[PDB]
Amino acid sequence: MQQQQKEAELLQKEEANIRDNQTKIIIAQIQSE
Amino acid sequence: MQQQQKEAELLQKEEANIRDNQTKIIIAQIQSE
Numbered sequence: 001m002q003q004q005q006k007e008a009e010l011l012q013k014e015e016a017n018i019r020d021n022q023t024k025i026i027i028a029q030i031q032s033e
Numbered sequence: 034m035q036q037q038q039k040e041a042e043l044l045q046k047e048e049a050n051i052r053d054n055q056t057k058i059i060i061a062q063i064q065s066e
Binding site: 001005008009012015016019020026027030031033 | 046047
């Protein structure tokens with residue numbers, strides 16, 4: 001259970017980073033208009 | 034109970050990050066006007 005919750009932290013962190021990065025490129029596209 | 038509260042921290046953190054990211058793109062849209 002400890003391992004499962006800790007890899008849950010891992011995947012939450014990586015997907016949060018991905019979401020922030022996607023929105024970064026999205027605002028870049030918005031300002032490129 | 035410890036596991037439940039700690040995953041509550043996890044979901045609070047990820048949804049807070051999502052809210053900040055959404056407002057980031059919102060201000061980008063506002064300034065794009």
